Amino acid sequence: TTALVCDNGSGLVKAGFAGDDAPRAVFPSIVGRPRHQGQKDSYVGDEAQSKRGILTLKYPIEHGIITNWDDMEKIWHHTFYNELRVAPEEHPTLLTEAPLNPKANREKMTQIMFETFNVPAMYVAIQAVLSLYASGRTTGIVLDSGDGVTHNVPIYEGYALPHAIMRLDLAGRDLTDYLMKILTERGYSFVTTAEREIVRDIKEKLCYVALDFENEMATAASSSSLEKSYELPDGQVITIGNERFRCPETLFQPSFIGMESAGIHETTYNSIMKCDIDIRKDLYANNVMSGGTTMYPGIADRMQKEITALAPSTMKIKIIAPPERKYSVWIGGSILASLSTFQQMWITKQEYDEAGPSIVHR
Amino acid sequence: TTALVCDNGSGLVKAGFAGDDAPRAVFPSIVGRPRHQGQKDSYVGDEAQSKRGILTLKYPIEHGIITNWDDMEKIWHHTFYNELRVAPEEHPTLLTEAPLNPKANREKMTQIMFETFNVPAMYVAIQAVLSLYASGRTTGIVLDSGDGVTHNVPIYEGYALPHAIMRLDLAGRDLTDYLMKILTERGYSFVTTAEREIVRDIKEKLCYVALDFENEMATAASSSSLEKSYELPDGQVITIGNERFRCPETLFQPSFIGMESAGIHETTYNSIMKCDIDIRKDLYANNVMSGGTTMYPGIADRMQKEITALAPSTMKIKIIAPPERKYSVWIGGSILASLSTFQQMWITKQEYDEAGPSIVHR
Amino acid sequence: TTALVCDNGSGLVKAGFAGDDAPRAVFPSIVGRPRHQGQKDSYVGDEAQSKRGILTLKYPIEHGIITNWDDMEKIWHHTFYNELRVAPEEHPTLLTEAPLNPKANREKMTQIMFETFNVPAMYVAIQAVLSLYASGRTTGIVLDSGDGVTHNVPIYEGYALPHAIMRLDLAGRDLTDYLMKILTERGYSFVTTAEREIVRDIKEKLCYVALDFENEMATAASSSSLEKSYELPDGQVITIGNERFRCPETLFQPSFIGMESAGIHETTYNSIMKCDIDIRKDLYANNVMSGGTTMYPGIADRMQKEITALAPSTMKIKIIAPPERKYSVWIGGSILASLSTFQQMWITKQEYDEAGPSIVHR
Amino acid sequence: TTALVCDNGSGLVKAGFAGDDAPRAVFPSIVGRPRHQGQKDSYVGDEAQSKRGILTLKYPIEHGIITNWDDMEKIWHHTFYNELRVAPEEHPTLLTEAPLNPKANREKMTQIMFETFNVPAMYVAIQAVLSLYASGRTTGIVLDSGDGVTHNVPIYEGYALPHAIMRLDLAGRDLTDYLMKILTERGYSFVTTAEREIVRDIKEKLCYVALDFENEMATAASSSSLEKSYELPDGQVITIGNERFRCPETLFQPSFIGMESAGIHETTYNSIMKCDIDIRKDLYANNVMSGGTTMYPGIADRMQKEITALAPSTMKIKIIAPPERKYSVWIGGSILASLSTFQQMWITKQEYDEAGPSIVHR
Amino acid sequence: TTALVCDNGSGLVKAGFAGDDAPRAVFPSIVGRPRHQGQKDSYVGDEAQSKRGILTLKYPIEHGIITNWDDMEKIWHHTFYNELRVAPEEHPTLLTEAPLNPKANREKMTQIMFETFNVPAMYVAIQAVLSLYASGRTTGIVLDSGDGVTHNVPIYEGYALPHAIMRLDLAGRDLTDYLMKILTERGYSFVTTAEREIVRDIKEKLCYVALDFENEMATAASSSSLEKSYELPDGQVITIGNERFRCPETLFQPSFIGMESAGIHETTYNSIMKCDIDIRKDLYANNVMSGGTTMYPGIADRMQKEITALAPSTMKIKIIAPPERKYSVWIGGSILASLSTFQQMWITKQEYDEAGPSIVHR
Amino acid sequence: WXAXCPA
Amino acid sequence: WXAXCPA
Amino acid sequence: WXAXCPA
Amino acid sequence: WXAXCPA
Amino acid sequence: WXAXCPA
Ligand SMILES: Nc1ncnc2c1ncn2[C@@H]1O[C@H](COP(=O)(O)OP(=O)(O)O)[C@@H](O)[C@H]1O
Ligand SMILES: Nc1ncnc2c1ncn2[C@@H]1O[C@H](COP(=O)(O)OP(=O)(O)O)[C@@H](O)[C@H]1O
Ligand SMILES: Nc1ncnc2c1ncn2[C@@H]1O[C@H](COP(=O)(O)OP(=O)(O)O)[C@@H](O)[C@H]1O
Ligand SMILES: Nc1ncnc2c1ncn2[C@@H]1O[C@H](COP(=O)(O)OP(=O)(O)O)[C@@H](O)[C@H]1O
Ligand SMILES: Nc1ncnc2c1ncn2[C@@H]1O[C@H](COP(=O)(O)OP(=O)(O)O)[C@@H](O)[C@H]1O
Ligand SMILES: [Mg+2]
Ligand SMILES: [Mg+2]
Ligand SMILES: [Mg+2]
Ligand SMILES: [Mg+2]
Ligand SMILES: [Mg+2]
Fold first, then answer.
1. N6-methyllysine-modified residues are where (chains A, B, C, D, E)?
2. Is E293 in the pocket of ligand 5 (CB under 6 A)?
3. Residue A179: how many CA atoms within 13 Å on its side-chain side?
4. How far is Cα of residue D191 from the mean position of the Cα atoms in its chain?
5. Among the listed residues D8, D3, D14, D86, the one whose alpha carbon sits nearest the alpha carbon of residue D340
6. With an 8 Å Cβ cutoff, are A159 and B234 in contact?
7. What is the C-alpha separation between E175 and E166, in angstroms, rounded?
8. Cβ atoms A64, D188 nearer than 8 A
9. Bridge partners (DSSP) listed for residue A287
10. Closest alpha carbon within chain A to H5
11. Contacts of D212 (CB under 8 A, 6+ apart)
């Protein structure tokens, strides 16, 4: 009966039943295989995290694109039968995706759902618009920036503005890699796959967004007041200085990792510029930030500052970035699925069988 | 009971009950449809203005001719049931038109009234003569120049002089388009439909009529004392120079937009010349200016100057252009409808059914 | 002595000496700066194309408007001294522009010519009318649609009809961007500036205009007979399906990229409607298509079809779109400059110095 | 039926039937030959120990390598037919070896089993992993240090970590020789082969591991409280001072006998360092000490101290060294053989005959 | 006057004067201390090699990181005063490093130069880019793989591409250790520090890279035709079979020693993928292999094969690996130092004193 | 442009 | 991706 | 290194 | 209009 | 061993 929402993010798999205010199964989208000889052939999610020291971990998803279907399928298997404990044929499902992903990706997923899982009916939604539902708004700009891919979708009074959707491949995993390089110059070394996950943990705890990056650098140079300590799994102590903010800074200056794209504050701005002047004001007053990377301390304030400078004077910049923004997409899914209007939008197996995979593009 | 007056202008829809000194429902004659995908199929009037950034706006009326009956009908629907909150079958109605509109237009309107709205009785009047009633005069020349079409009707002691009625398609919307082109050379760009409406707003606030156009140009070239600032909806600042009067100048020199017609000051003069010499004096002393385009600051003075030059010496040129001239037509309607003599002129459904649409030409 | 013609297009810089039947220096209007650290500060034209992988490329011109004067100046410098190998003070020069560009743009160019380059005399001409000279006609409609901006200028027996000039910002670069988005859904990704240029190359080789867009879509869905292969610079193979015509289709349906403007076939038609009925026939029989976007295979036939439908029956629609239409503007310049009558039109430095920049508006 | 486990150590031969909790035949791996003329040609095990005064004793195994195949074979003969009283063709057998022994050694053994003894099936296992089974663990570090060779194998959750296996030739026999040299300076002399065995007996009874070697030396210098008495076979009395701990100290300081290797406490540590950080904690909490040299009193405490210093603070060092650790390998064998899963791993004569000796490397 | 180039590799110290085509002092970066008691406290380089049997040898450098500053300093002392016979204050010096070494390392070196040695001026360069100069190229990929650390730096037309620099700790010393383990299973044993150096010598003479590793293994199994003989310092004869290529194979399959990194052929490929498509072709045609590990016979051919498979068809893979590639870094140093442009890049003591150690990061 | 569109 | 970037 | 690997 | 001008 | 050490 009750629809099952499943957010196939590139970082975490967030699944749960519609109507709830929180996902029930949240775990890493990771498949691990034994690096050495010896006992499972592979481990998934928390299993992989638990035994990661001896596993080669792979992400089946990259930048919102499924690259390894075998592993992808495996995760879904694991999800439905081990995490949620539910037969998929009992419920409608809601899957999500990032804007502009290759159509083959979308269709392939659908195929699997109507073959391996025999899902009664399904629907694929844009992560961004779901986030908007969670925010209680019909107008605003959704900035979804998680592990996989950053994107920006302007929405106005319940209407889409597809011609101004931005996509930026700069995301959480890139910040991770960048951070590794920085830790290297500091005096450490994180190069194994298991080490990758450690690095991630550090980032999530000690990084923050400087208000004025340059002054923050100066202060860091001036003294050790910003330095923090992080204890590694084996008891060693990591001392971190200016890396605590030099890392996340990359979001505003992608050039740090060789990208030509402007920072996310300009990406947002640009999307706004692509919309007709009549609605720009409304969008300025309703920026919605969501997704894991928007969890950095002070990122909203930094964002405000950046936009304020770019935007015309007097155009109040209001940024909405509430607690739990990390799960706003999943929440949106819960909402939408429970919405009775929406029920007409389900894609049934019946329709699929008759029309073929192309049907999903609707 | 109380007659309902409805001025179907090409710019604004002005409706209200007879006896009142002001229209109750005044809003743009615009129907808007969603430019992008997403929620109504269409929006009307203020709705359209409110969400215009995402709508393609259409005017159902052009130059006083109804070009889109579906949209026209829709506006009337909206008017009666959403703006005035009244069932049309309860009241006589008064509609208006500009001189020389195609007879098919007139009849089609009538048909709708006796089908869709089931109006008890109705009458179609010339906008010009209504304006004259509002001015408290029986003799004069009515210059009706609004959004749609400019026209000029000479009236003498309660008698019409149809052989000297002038019609000029140059009107408010043409001034709008011309202004756009000028703003372009200034350094701006207003090409979308939503932008059109913005341009209109500017015009209505910052344009005025130069007394001596050439000297005004010289002064504008000399310095920035005439420049004004206009803040756009998104906070940008428009700096406007000589466009503040170069735009409205077109009314006196239609050649600016490629028309062969002489300016409105000569149009008026010509109408006078077509009348028998005996009454020309009376007409010179009673020019009545009404309609939205006559709202430009100093246009009356400019007009006086122009006519004074054209007219014989000593022929006092008196131009009447009172406050609220913008609504003089509607006011005239209120008056006429309340007039008891007039009651014999209503066209009843009964008569219509028996004679057919041709009956309106009376 | 011999006048120097220089077509400052937004795509290509086309310069050469008057009297020749072809430009001598044709190269991209691009200025590139090192994305990473290392050797020139910047590269121009073919240099930029050669090393584009490590450069951030900028176009100084957008939609026919010069946005970056420093880079613009640089290109001219490069042109005159590196491509043509000639001191500018030795020759009269002819520059071109699109209709309705902001007057400040025009004047600024002129200023540079009389300061940095010390050009003896110069003249700025509309690209459209030059194209007409190249076609050997005095009557027709010039459809200039290149990289920067599309525009349409009706000309009759040597006289201009300025009140009916159309300007449409939809142009080659927009088609490029649109195509990128399409390639994304196909399964590829072109987001860097260098990649932009690659995309352009593809377009120029594999796109064509479908006669009946809908049927063409159906056929593309039906089979792979329309698919082509394009080898990328690094040896990868791109397989392209319906994108080979879905891209250029945008010219007839601007709504694909969120614009409200009607397609170019209606733009042309509308311009015709704005002309007095007496000359519409002559214009119908002499449509002239020129500029790079008119190079798509079959675009003329498609155009004919579209106009034929819009135009009254029996109004023979003749479209002239000869080989080398790509350079018709430059050719026109060669012609005009060699024309002896024209010599009186040069704007000398002397005149400029006395009157000031305003002089160019003549 | 019941598998026969045989631990071919360099010190003792420990054999017995799987399922039992203790080996049935435990005796020295020694072959003795008459030093003088005289009656067997040779004596084995306890025979050799009994008559050792007139025999030249040889060990067929050195550092885990079989050096004398004739004598080796002889011991097996003796074992099976004199100690266990069982025909080898009746049972599967389990042999053991130390990590990194030369492959020729391994194969040669196998050959003998399938020729001289006609063993139905056999398997060769690493002594270290068997010890781990005896400890009831799937994760830990096995420190096997017996007579022959010391080695260290890290194991994690049932998986091997071969890239971090350490081998140290320092073992019980080296301690024996070192002790001899020390006894010499004390005032005694043990140089014959028979005397060697006496020395060994002393070691096993009176040596212990000092907690703080230096302080222990000081105390020994201070007084005779540490001195002990040992009565020799012929009734003489040996008085032993600081040699009671100076001998075993060599395990922590191999430099005493000219080796470059670090002590066993660093060997263990180093192995840990070679494992990925993620599992180092688990290994620290599960050190398993087994084999005869770990029988010295207080060696575990000393070990803990040493590791504690080397390991990061807070990394609880837990050392498991239970009673009967001396036979943990044999016990492990009993376990594994009784394990039903394991049955698939037996190498049958059939397979051997077809593939050849190389088959054992699996 | 003449600059002094000093390549502080982890294997060999290569120093000499700029302008020469070969280093003058080439010797092992080893410091040895007496294992037993006895006469110097320590021996360096060739001294250490000469008396290595009684010395504990240490490398002050590991993976390009200086771990023992006292010993490092000692080597420099020895170099300048015993090998080159020159006072350091007389000449500018050029030191080198591998990419991504910890900044503290870099600075510490600098400090020493401006304290202990009082070097007039100095500069630290990346080993990779120097190699490129030696190859006579401005474009290519430098694969520097020596004793210490393997790294890969893509360079394009004189510009760096830092965002795609790869670092791989797999290097010559790891191959050495791996080989030891293999020799063990063969039947030998090399565990002392002196033995390490012997092993190295063997490797450098008898190892080669198999074209098709698997077939080579098969052949080795098939017969002794690949076996070679190597006489040890004490006259013993080593017979080596498949180890002659199984060892170096590790460079293509790091998993042999427990690493997760892909082989060097994929490392290179990956770096290429991280560069913008526009320049990938140029890089494919200019791979430059240098450093001691690239001395293995046939490694270039193997490399070509591997890359050819990975790269798109038709992308000619050209690998440049000339004679003397072993010293290309040193050569590059000679070149750069003699280059007059470069002189502005020297870091003077003056600047150092004023700014502090941070200055080197430029 | 200085309004409407970028340029 | 099947071109540009990896995915 | 001061973590990860030895150096 | 149905001729001359649009309307 | 057949080299290094005895065994
Ligand atoms: N406290 C935190 N601060 C910053 N980033 C975080 C935090 N917690 C999680 N993240 C990041 O969020 C990403 C996952 O968030 P999510 O939005 O769910 O990704 P996705 O939707 O792409 O799966 C990871 O890259 C993770 O590092
Ligand atoms: N302050 C103003 N100055 C000039 N024009 C105005 C002003 N206010 C309204 N208008 C113009 O008046 C027109 C609408 O007036 P109206 O006479 O009601 O038109 P219509 O009768 O054709 O509907 C519009 O074109 C509008 O721009
Ligand atoms: N074969 C072709 N097919 C379609 N478009 C082309 C072709 N060759 C060039 N173009 C396009 O023409 C434009 C440049 O033409 P041009 O008319 O010179 O532009 P501009 O005059 O604005 O500089 C570019 O956008 C380019 O892609
Ligand atoms: N009480 C003891 N204390 C110390 N060492 C002992 C003791 N008993 C036996 N040993 C030593 O243990 C070694 C034999 O143990 P074991 O582990 O079975 O050797 P291996 O497995 O190599 O045959 C001998 O070197 C012997 O001296
Ligand atoms: N003939 C050879 N074949 C293979 N490797 C060699 C040869 N000669 C030297 N080497 C290896 O090269 C390494 C030293 O080379 P080098 O590039 O100078 O190292 P580094 O630059 O790190 O000091 C050593 O590991 C050595 O074994
Ligand atoms: Mg997300
Ligand atoms: Mg009106
Ligand atoms: Mg052009
Ligand atoms: Mg043992
Ligand atoms: Mg090197």
1. 74
2. yes
3. 30
4. 23
5. D3
6. no
7. 19
8. no
9. A141, A319
10. A189
11. none
- Among candidate residues D144, D69, D151, D79, the one with its CA nearest the CA of residue D104: D69
Interface of E with J (CB under 8 A): 187-191, 195, 232, 236, 238
Beta-carbon separation of A192 and D315 below 8 A: no
The beta-carbon neighbor of D163 closest among E35, E184, E257 is: E257
Nearest Cα neighbor of A242 from A224, A268, A229, A255 is: A224
**Residue E337: left if φ>0, alpha if ψ -120 to 50, beta else—which one?**
alpha
CB C124 within 8 A of CB C95: yes
Q: Residues, chain H, total?
A: 7
| Residue where the block lists tokens 């000398």 | C348
List strand residue ranges (DSSP E) for B29-169, in order: 31-34, 43-44, 55-58, 61-62, 65-66, 93-97, 121-126, 140-145, 150-156, 159-160, 166-168
Distance separating alpha carbons of residues D352 and C151, to the nearest angstrom = 87
The two tokens of residue C158 are: 């040597």
State the Cα–Cα distance between residues C294 and C131, nearest whole angstrom.
13
Contact residues for E122 (Cβ-Cβ < 8 A; gap 6+): E92, E93, E94, E95, E110, E113, E114, E346, E347
Q: Are strands A319-320 and A287-290 parallel, antiparallel or unpaired?
A: parallel
Contact A287, A267 (CB under 8 A): no
Residue E290 CA to ligand 5 center (angstroms) comes to 10
Residues of chain C found within 8 Å of residue A103, distances taken between Cβ atoms: 185-187
Q: Does D157 touch chain A if contact means CB atoms closer than 8 Å?
A: yes
Is F5 near chain C, with CB under 8 Å?
Answer: yes
SS3 of residue A72 by DSSP = helix
User: Which experimental method was this entry solved with?
Assistant: cryo-EM
What is the C-alpha separation between E102 and D52, in angstroms, rounded? 63
A28 lines ligand 1 (CB under 6 A): no
With contact defined as beta carbons under 8 Å apart, do B139 and B153 qualify?
Answer: no
Kind of pairing, strands C4-8 and C12-17?
A: antiparallel
Distance CA B251, CA B112 (A): 35
CATH topology of domain E1-30+61-124+327-361: Nucleotidyltransferase; domain 5 (3.30.420)
User: Which chains have 3 or more CB–CB distances shorter than 8 Å to chain F?
Assistant: B, C
Radius of gyration, CA atoms only, chain F: 4
- What amino acid is encoded at A21 in this protein? D
How many H-runs (helices) and E-runs (strands) does chain J carry? 0, 0
The residue extents of the domains of chain B are 1-30+61-124+327-361, 31-58, 126-171+261-322, 172-257
The structure tokens listed for C250 are 């945008």
> Nearest-CA neighbor of D122 among D332, D350, D328?
D350
User: Could you name the CATH architecture of E31-58?
Assistant: Roll (2.30)
Element (H, E) at A125: strand A121-126
Q: Regarding beta strands B319-320 and B347-348, do their DSSP bridges make them parallel or antiparallel, or are they unpaired?
A: unpaired
Same fold, E1-30+61-124+327-361 and E126-171+261-322: yes
The resolution in Å comes to: 3.6
What is the rounded distance in angstroms from the CA atom of residue D167 to the CA atom of residue E191? 10
Using a 6 Å cutoff on CB, does residue A296 contact ligand 1? yes
d(CA D75, CA D25): 12
Looking at the domain E172-257, which fold is it?
Answer: Actin; Chain A, domain 4 (3.90.640)
Residue B191 amino acid letter = V
Q: Judge whether B4 and B323 are in contact, CB under 8 Å.
A: no
Contacts of D243 (CB under 8 A, 6+ apart): D179, D182, D183, D186, D207
DSSP E192: S
The answer regarding whether domain D126-171+261-322 maps to CATH 3.30.1360.180 reads: no
Chain breaks in chain G (C to N over 2.5 A) after: none
Q: Are strands C319-320 and C43-44 parallel, antiparallel or unpaired?
A: unpaired
Whether residue D96 contacts residue D334, with contact meaning beta carbons closer than 8 Å, is answered with no
At residue D178, what is the residue type?
Answer: Y
